[PDB]
Amino acid sequence: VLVANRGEIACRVMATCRRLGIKTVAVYSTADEQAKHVKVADESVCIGPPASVESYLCIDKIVDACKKTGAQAVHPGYGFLSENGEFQSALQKNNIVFVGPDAHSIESMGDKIESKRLAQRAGVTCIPGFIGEVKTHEDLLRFAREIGYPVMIKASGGGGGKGMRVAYNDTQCVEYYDMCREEAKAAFHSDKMLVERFIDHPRHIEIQVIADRRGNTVYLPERECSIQRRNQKVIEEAPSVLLDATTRKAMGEEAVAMARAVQYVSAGTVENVVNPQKQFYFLEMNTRLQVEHPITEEITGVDLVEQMLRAAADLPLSITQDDITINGHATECRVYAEDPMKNYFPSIGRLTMYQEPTGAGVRCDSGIIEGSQISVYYDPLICKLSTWGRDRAECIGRMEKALDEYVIRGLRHNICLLRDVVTEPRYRSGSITTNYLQEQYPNGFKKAELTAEEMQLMYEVAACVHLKRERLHYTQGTAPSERQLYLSVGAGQEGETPVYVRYLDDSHFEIGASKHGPFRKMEVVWKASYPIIRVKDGEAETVLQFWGTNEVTYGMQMRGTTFDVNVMSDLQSTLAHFVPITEATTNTKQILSPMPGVIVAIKVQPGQMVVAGEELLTLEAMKMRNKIHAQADGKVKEVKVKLGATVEDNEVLVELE
Amino acid sequence: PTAAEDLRHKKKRLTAMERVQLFCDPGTFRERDALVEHECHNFGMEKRKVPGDGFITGTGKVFGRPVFLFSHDFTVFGGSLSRTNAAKVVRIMEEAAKIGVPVIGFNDSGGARIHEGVDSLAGYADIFLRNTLFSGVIPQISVIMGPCAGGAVYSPAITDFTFMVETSSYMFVTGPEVVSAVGGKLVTKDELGGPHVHATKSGVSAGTFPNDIVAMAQLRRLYSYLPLSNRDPVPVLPTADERYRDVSSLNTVVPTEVKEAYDMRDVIYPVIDHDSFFEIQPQFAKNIICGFARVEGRSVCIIANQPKVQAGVLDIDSSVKGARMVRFADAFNIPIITFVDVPGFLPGVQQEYGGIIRHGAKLLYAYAEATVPKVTIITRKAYGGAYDVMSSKHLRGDSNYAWPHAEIAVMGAAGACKLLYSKETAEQQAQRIADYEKTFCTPLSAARKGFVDAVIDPSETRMRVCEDLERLARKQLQNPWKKHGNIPL
Numbered sequence A: 001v002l003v004a005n006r007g008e009i010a011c012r013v014m015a016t017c018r019r020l021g022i023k024t025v026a027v028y029s030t031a032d033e034q035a036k037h038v039k040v041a042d043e044s045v046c047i048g049p050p051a052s053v054e055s056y057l058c059i060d061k062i063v064d065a066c067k068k069t070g071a072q073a074v075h076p077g078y079g080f081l082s083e084n085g086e087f088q089s090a091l092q093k094n095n096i097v098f099v100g101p102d103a104h105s106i107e108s109m110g111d112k113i114e115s116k117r118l119a120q121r122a123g124v125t126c127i128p129g130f131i132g133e134v135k136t137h138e139d140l141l142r143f144a145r146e147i148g149y150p151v152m153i154k155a156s157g158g159g160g161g162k163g164m165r166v167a168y169n170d171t172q173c174v175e176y177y178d179m180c181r182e183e184a185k186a187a188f189h190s191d192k193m194l195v196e197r198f199i200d201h202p203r204h205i206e207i208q209v210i211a212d213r214r215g216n217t218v219y220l221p222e223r224e225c226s227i228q229r230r231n232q233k234v235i236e237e238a239p240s241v242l243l244d245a246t247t248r249k250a251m252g253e254e255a256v257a258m259a260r261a262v263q264y265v266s267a268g269t270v271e272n273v274v275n276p277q278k279q280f281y282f283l284e285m286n287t288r289l290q291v292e293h294p295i296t297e298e299i300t301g302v303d304l305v306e307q308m309l310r311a312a313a314d315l316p317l318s319i320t321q322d323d324i325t326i327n328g329h330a331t332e333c334r335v336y337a338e339d340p341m342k343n344y345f346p347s348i349g350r351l352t353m354y355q356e357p358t359g360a361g362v363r364c365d366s367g368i369i370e371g372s373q374i375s376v377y378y379d380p381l382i383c384k385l386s387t388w389g390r391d392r393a394e395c396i397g398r399m400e401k402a403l404d405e406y407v408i409r410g411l412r413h414n415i416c417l418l419r420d421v422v423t424e425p426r427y428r429s430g431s432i433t434t435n436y437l438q439e440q441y442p443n444g445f446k447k448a449e450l451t452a453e454e455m456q457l458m459y460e461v462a463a464c465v466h467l468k469r470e471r472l473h474y475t476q477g478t479a480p481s482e483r484q485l486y487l488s489v490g491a492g493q494e495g496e497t498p499v500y501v502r503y504l505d506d507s508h509f510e511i512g513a514s515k516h517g518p519f520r521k522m523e524v525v526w527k528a529s530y531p532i533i534r535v536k537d538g539e540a541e542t543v544l545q546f547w548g549t550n551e552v553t554y555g556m557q558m559r560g561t562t563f564d565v566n567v568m569s570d571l572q573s574t575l576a577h578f579v580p581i582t583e584a585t586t587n588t589k590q591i592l593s594p595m596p597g598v599i600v601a602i603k604v605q606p607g608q609m610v611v612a613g614e615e616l617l618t619l620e621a622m623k624m625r626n627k628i629h630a631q632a633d634g635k636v637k638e639v640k641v642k643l644g645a646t647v648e649d650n651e652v653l654v655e656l657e
Numbered sequence B: 001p002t003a004a005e006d007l008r009h010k011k012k013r014l015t016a017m018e019r020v021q022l023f024c025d026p027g028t029f030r031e032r033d034a035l036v037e038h039e040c041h042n043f044g045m046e047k048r049k050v051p052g053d054g055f056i057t058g059t060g061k062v063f064g065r066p067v068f069l070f071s072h073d074f075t076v077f078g079g080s081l082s083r084t085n086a087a088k089v090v091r092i093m094e095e096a097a098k099i100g101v102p103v104i105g106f107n108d109s110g111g112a113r114i115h116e117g118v119d120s121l122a123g124y125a126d127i128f129l130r131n132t133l134f135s136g137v138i139p140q141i142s143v144i145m146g147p148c149a150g151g152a153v154y155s156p157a158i159t160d161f162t163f164m165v166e167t168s169s170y171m172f173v174t175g176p177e178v179v180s181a182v183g184g185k186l187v188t189k190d191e192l193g194g195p196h197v198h199a200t201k202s203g204v205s206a207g208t209f210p211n212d213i214v215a216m217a218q219l220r221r222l223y224s225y226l227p228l229s230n231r232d233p234v235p236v237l238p239t240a241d242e243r244y245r246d247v248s249s250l251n252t253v254v255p256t257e258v259k260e261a262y263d264m265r266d267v268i269y270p271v272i273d274h275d276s277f278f279e280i281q282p283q284f285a286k287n288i289i290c291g292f293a294r295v296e297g298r299s300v301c302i303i304a305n306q307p308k309v310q311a312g313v314l315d316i317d318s319s320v321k322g323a324r325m326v327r328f329a330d331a332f333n334i335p336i337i338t339f340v341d342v343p344g345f346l347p348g349v350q351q352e353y354g355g356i357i358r359h360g361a362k363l364l365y366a367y368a369e370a371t372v373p374k375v376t377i378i379t380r381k382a383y384g385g386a387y388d389v390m391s392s393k394h395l396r397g398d399s400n401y402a403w404p405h406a407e408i409a410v411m412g413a414a415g416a417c418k419l420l421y422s423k424e425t426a427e428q429q430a431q432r433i434a435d436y437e438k439t440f441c442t443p444l445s446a447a448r449k450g451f452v453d454a455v456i457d458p459s460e461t462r463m464r465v466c467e468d469l470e471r472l473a474r475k476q477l478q479n480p481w482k483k484h485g486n487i488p489l
């Protein structure tokens, strides 16, 4: 079989075949000649230029290419043009298997409209509210009391969240109807309002579904997709805390009942919104192969890929709802190349200087091997880290530990945000909401700080590392074994903390306050000039990272955050006070081209916003295109140098004001 | 007790003794001479004698290995040299010539001492002669912590490496007063000879540091690389890194387009051991990189082009930089590893008006005269005389390697097509340039001739380099008998 995706899922598929003993083929674009899925595959064929359209999206190339492998079936994947009719039609022109759902169900359910029809076909507890215009305030109050809901005032013709106000009491109902009619009459030319059961605070619970072309339909355990930034989810978890069998059993039964309704074959997944009063709302249903199943597979072992490919041959499944159980729970997170602390700045075109994944009792699905890069015209996802567990505390701690052991170098990421979110006591309380993120991050993003004991431990580990790397340079036995260091982070030596060290063995020290002070005998295990640093005092265990140094300042990472600790002796400490600290030039002015050349491409527009790290234009000289970018600034005021202006000579190409 | 140094520190500056204490080991400095006077007897100098006479000379010890050093003192007479100051320095250099030990000096002198007359010139001449004679015998490093003017500037110049401190140091031959007197332009001391000027414009300073503390901390690290003398072998340090570490990221560094640029450091860093690069002259002639690095625990010399800056084109400044680095590396038996990516020489009238012919020959002379083991890797391209200059196999090179997408040709395809068909029918571009580039802009022809040993996968570079550098440990080559060469100055 041949896949249709070029991400982690492709690798997953070419991995499921291992046990299924199925030879696999994987196509690629020109830029992806070095992707892992190309070498993992048994066969590879090029699909032209790497721009999205020609790459994979070029059905004609793809369907035509499906004539040499011999494979009797070809996976549709989950992205790009997966589950598409124009594609399903073409594949049934050449009479080949789709390894996916049937057309009629797909167009009946994935369609934007008429989904409410199928929803109300059997009702299935669809959105509740007075179905019609509320012409009077009396009707609005009466229908609000009917269910005593937060009103969910929404315009009949309005969409996207415009014309919506949340009413909690009758006076609020009247005032918000008065505002809503005024807003909607001006904005959408419709005064027709509707009132529905608004949700106190949503959790966005999701229910998984599987089926088959013969029978033995099964309901998979539900999942969580509460956390969501810009309508994109981050953290997922299958057995949500607010789970009662009274609801859940009916959820599975109703999902299976809806399944046969449209004769769905390859079930996508069911979407719900759940309030603390344990309701459910079947709508916004999915018909795509969601790849958040690893979590469910961790709590079940139900290999969705194997079962769906088995059903693609008109055979029933190998599992029934009778044996499906729960053996704990799993947590999954997504690693993006999106720089959060810097206003969510995108960082692309950077191959991995060097990276190593966490592999301690955890699972990681990724398509980015060492020496791989991310283009702008693709998904900036790095890895899909998922860890098995049985208890919240157990599963989370694992994630905590596994986050710190993920070495990524060569480009930014959002691991700090994931770490801070997981460590927050609100997240460990047990329950969350969908507005959780912006509720806990009002102004931008700011990572939480360190407690006193954590900073002390970081100091101790830094001193141990300094001594260990110092002993390497000495010759033969003429080496020291004890010092007294003065650690102080910050440019002003904030909190000078005297530290000792003794190095009793290769990976054991006798850290103390100073000489003639009680000693603790911690342990540090670190390979010289490497990232990972495992330190264990008593029971507590920590993992820190070592970035680099200039022999007075150490670049060490603590809880997914970079710091610069200063490790200096008595003389250096007493002398660093008497050192000039000059301030570098802070110039917000025009930028000039360093060398002569020709401008062939421009990226930014005249007199608009500019952010740090953004490419601006590209000169070509002596057969070579450079690319001077914007180091750092907010905006510009200038006149653009036009295309093909072979002038340069250190002119003012862009002027920053 | 912190007497007499409060006046110094109040100006945000350190003292000579404090610098010496910071450089060496905690308790291994033994000051040599401390009670010496100037015995001048002129211009009312018979009084105000000083015990130290403005110099601190000792022995010290760094990383368990011996050293010699001296430091000027700015408080006493402004650091001026004399018939008596220079005697201590001469004695130290002579002793460090008998024993195979290097010398490091921290310059702070304000100029010559006028009250001694021509005795200051005598001392300067003696120091110059010692530097000239002992260059190439023991490594010499110089750091400039404060003002350095007059004719005293020449002795740091002859030394192998000169470093500078950022805020409070400068160096030049003639003061701005004379410049105003003759030309009439008002230029400040920093605008004339500041650390930035010598870092970027003149190319004299080999580096710049932000503070004295950082200067000492990194000077120790630099000292950890050098061999002790001319006859001593290259130092080898223990290291947990191993030649079997996987480097497969090199397969993707070179883009598939011939007009796109990349950073050569992405090729340099994987091959060498982790966090073991010490760049030399980082802000001058950025199209070429030179420095020191370790390969399997032994120090080597690195010289590579960079297509990031000016398409990696050789030039005057790059030629001088590479020539000096190669000469120093060969003088002390240090292996050389080079990475080649050059389209040719920089074209322009200013270049010929500035003597490209002289300067470009220096790098070729340095590469041909060298007798240390050499390893060369051609990543993408090498054209014209630039291929010859950058350690080609014909210049007694030990082992040469190429990557599968390399190109070695006489010149670009356009010029060859033009010269090979004078008045051939128009549109000849499309069906001739492509064919010529396909047939002869590839390493197959150069491999057929025997100019590259083998064509290797980019993932095997570390393995090959470690193997070759281990095997070549005991090469013995000698040049014909000469009093000395005649390099094109």
Ligand SMILES: O=CCCCC[C@@H]1SC[C@@H]2NC(=O)N[C@@H]21
Pocket: A622, A623, B313, B343, B344, B345, B346, B347, B412, B414
């Ligand atoms: O084709 C016309 C210009 C080609 C220049 C190619 C580079 S520029 C500097 C160097 N000198 C040459 O002759 N070729 C290279």
